[PDB]
Amino acid sequence: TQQPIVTGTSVISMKYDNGVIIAADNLGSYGSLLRFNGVERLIPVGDNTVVGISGDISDMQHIERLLKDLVTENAYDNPLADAEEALEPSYIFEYLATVMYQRRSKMNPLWNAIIVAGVQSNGDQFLRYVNLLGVTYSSPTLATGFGAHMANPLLRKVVDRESDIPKTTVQVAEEAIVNAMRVLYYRDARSSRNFSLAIIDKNTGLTFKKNLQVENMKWDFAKDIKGYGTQKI
């Protein structure tokens, strides 16, 4: 991909005491045209990984096919494909990151930003980022695009350092994620009101909520805004 066509906006995520949460809206934009709705940008892998992808949608579908074939291959000649030798979030990340950096180095990137989120076999929380440059980093909160500018400041007021992760409950984290989604719908011109949200909990497994909607929006004060300065009516 040399320039993106159908694109998806921010993907937000954070860690909490027993797992991770990741969310993304269901919109595929075509420039300034909000062309496709119902576009699922969260790719669940196994019972312990969710991959949130933003950027070129065709490249995202290519990554979907890649993850599908990766699951199929790990199943081969693997009597423990559902137990000890099942796919881990770190495996899926490292694979995607290798691919991203190899495509960048071959001067033909996958025009994406990716957040892999899940729970390891030992219970640890995995949350890591990789983009079209091969850049990787990890933090208690992770967001792409506009989220990085708006979701992270909010989400970081809950988990500012590693020590805050045990203190954070799943309810607090999900509330923060939904509020950040509302803020993005307020201020991101390439966002949608409908979004999907995935929880990866080391006890309850993978919870996948689709067709969510931004609720409890404040719009009343708009009636009190007249003109742009001196106008009174």
């Binding site: 096919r65 074939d69 199929t72 199943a75 081969y76 000649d77 009597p79």
Partner: protein, 243 residues
């Protein structure tokens, strides 16, 4: 003379003797069977325990292709692994191009064309395996058997190995007695029975039973190995059925 020294050479009868020698290599192997049920297929294989140093339940013999195909083979096991690798490549290619998982007849013909190509030149050796495979696709259940010559057909039941003859006899009995078709669990039980029966040709060594199945209702069209309680139930059925 010397017509059997080089592969892909025609004898004056019109035969390829190297393929027949590969068939002998196949007949030297252990017994493996497949049974087509009402909504799926069942695969079973006997694994000789040469020594108790062998780890039980490990050394798995049945292989999976894509997520819906099961393959078992009798003969040179590494040749079977090579064939299964090629088949996995073929299925992956088919899915990547056409989105849908590869239909069972299509996969059968892929394997068959590969094995046949392995009889066209003197620079390659025929496969020393007979392969029973199949699964569930959009057109239902399919069971196939493929010979070292590249020949392959669809079967109600199939069997190869040293005990292939008694297995075929029992399969013909099962076919005659059940014109309506077997259920997946009944087919698993009958596969266990036929494996235990055909083991008598290797009676001097202990054997371990390995079963897998792909049923539209019991496994949701996916290939899964029969283990745990169902495997023990089939083992007990066979045990009290040999008496």
């Amino acid at each position: 003379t010397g017509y059997d020294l080089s592969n892909s050479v025609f004898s004056p009868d019109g035969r390829n003797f190297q393929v027949e020698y590969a068939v002998k290599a196949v007949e030297n192997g252990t017994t493996s069977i497949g049974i087509k049920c009402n909504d799926g297929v069942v695969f079973a294989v006997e694994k000789l325990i040469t020594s108790k140093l062998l780890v039980p339940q490990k050394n798995v013999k049945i292989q999976v292709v894509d997520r819906h195909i099961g393959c078992v083979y009798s003969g040179l096991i590494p040749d079977g692994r090579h064939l299964v690798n090629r088949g996995r490549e073929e299925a992956a290619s088919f899915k990547k191009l056409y989105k849908t998982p590869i239909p069972i007849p299509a996969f059968a013909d892929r394997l068959g064309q590969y094995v046949q190509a392995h009889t066209l030149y003197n620079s390659v050796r025929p496969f020393g395996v007979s392969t029973i495979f199949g699964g569930v696709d959009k057109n239902g259940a399919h069971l196939y058997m493929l010979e070292p010559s590249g020949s392959y057909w669809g079967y109600k039941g199939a069997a190869t190995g040293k005990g292939r003859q008694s297995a075929k006899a029992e399969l013909e009995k099962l076919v005659d007695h059940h014109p309506e078709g077997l259920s997946a669990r009944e087919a698993v039980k009958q596969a266990a029975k036929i494996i235990y029966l055909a083991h008598e040709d290797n009676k001097e060594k202990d054997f371990e039973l390995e079963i897998s199945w792909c049923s539209l209702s019991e496994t949701n069209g996916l290939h899964k190995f029969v283990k745990g309680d169902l495997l023990q139930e089939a083992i007990d059925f066979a045990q009290k059925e040999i008496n």
